[PDB]
Amino acid sequence: KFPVVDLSKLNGEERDQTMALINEACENWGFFEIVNHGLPHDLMDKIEKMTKDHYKTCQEQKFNDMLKSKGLDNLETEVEDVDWESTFYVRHLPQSNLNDISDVSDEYRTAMKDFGKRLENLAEDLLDLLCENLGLEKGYLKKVFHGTKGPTFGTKVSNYPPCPKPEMIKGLRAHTDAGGIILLFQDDKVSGLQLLKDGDWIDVPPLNHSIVINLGDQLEVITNGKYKSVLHRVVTQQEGNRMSVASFYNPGSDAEISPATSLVEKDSEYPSFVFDDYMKLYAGVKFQPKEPRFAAMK
Ligand SMILES: O=C(O)c1cnccn1
Ligand SMILES: [Zn+2]
């Protein structure tokens, strides 16, 4: 069953059982849900409402315009090179782009800034938990990610609108995430996100006021494969609009990424590289298998 971790259980006598569950999910699922994570319920409710409203007022017209312009207004055959997805990006660090998005409101912008800061603080707390589970010094992962300008932190704001013929196209094709740690505020009613575990696609259950955590390729490298980046996709449906507000805590562009030496006994099979070089390779082969990308950094 899909791991849901109650972070409030870290403050007392259940801490060891809870950390152990975090480690077990990191090893065997690559994903887990957290509850009682510190983010105000009211703020999540406001981000949810304003994202859905902005889709209706702005994104939806652009999505249908995109459909006709690619002939995707009439699905007849399988489409394996396009994602049934409506998306824009919000940059937080190194430098925010929030002031340049022309069609969002003052209240949205201010709320997104509040939300983004809180998520960045949670991302850093979660990485220290990972450090503790791995036997690394506190702040080890935060230090590796810093580079010279600090981490890269952005939010992908997506909707997966109803699709008449879901078996013809995915909402988002299977892939692993290139980056560090991913913090997803997903729709709490409409399913669609799945991960691959032990030969089966397993749904990431919609859960009110929860955050979905997963680990990217960079943590697989740093942990010497102890924590693997796992494949995931988004399927469409004929009815429903799945919301997705996914924030990515990634290394800075010039950060040197390598397996932590205390996790390496035998010579590591993972490469040492500069993060931007990984990103430039990933951009073009995102939906191809993950493992050639590690071998390509050698
Ligand atoms: O858009 C993605 O690739 C994504 C979104 N949420 C969680 C993980 N990955
Ligand atoms: Zn992803």
Residue numbers in the entry: 6 to 303
Q: What did the article's authors report about this structure?
A:
ACC is then oxidized by the ACC oxidase (ACCO or ACO, referred to as ACO in this study), giving rise to ethylene, carbon dioxide (CO2) and cyanide3. ACO enzyme is a 2OG-oxygenase ‘related' enzyme that belongs to the cupin superfamily, which uses a non-heme ferrous iron (Fe2+) as a cofactor and facilitates the integration of molecular oxygen into a myriad of biomolecules. ACO uses ascorbate, rather than 2-oxoglutarate as the co-substrate, and requires CO2, one of the products of the ACO reaction, as an activator. Overall, the structure of AtACO2 resembles the Petunia hybrid ACO (PhACO), featuring a double-stranded-helix jellyroll fold surrounded by α-helices.
We demonstrate that PZA is also converted to POA in plants, which directly binds to the ACO proteins and inhibits their enzyme activity. In contrast to PZA, POA inhibits the activity of AtACO2 in a concentration dependent manner (IC50=72.05±1.11 μM). POA interacted with AtACO2 in the present of Fe2+, with a dissociation constant (KD) of 14.8 μM. We subsequently co-crystallized AtACO2 with POA or 2-PA in the presence of Zn2+, and determined both structures at 2.1 Å. In both structures, the Zn2+ ion is coordinated by the facial triad, including His180, Asp182 and His237, and binds at a similar position as Fe2+ in PhACO. POA or 2-PA in turn binds to the Zn2+ via the carboxylate group and the N-2 nitrogen in the pyrazine or pyridine ring. The carboxylate group of POA or 2-PA forms a polar interaction with the side chain of Lys161. Besides these polar interactions, the pyrazine/pyridine ring structure also forms hydrophobic/van der Waals interactions with residues including Ile187, Leu189, Ala251 and Phe253. As such, POA or 2-PA would exclude ACC from coordinating with the metal ion, consistent with our kinetic analyses showing that POA is a competitive inhibitor of ACO. The SAR assays revealed the importance of its carboxylic group and the nitrogen in the ortho-position of POA for ACO binding and inhibition, which was validated by the crystal structure of the AtACO2–POA complex.
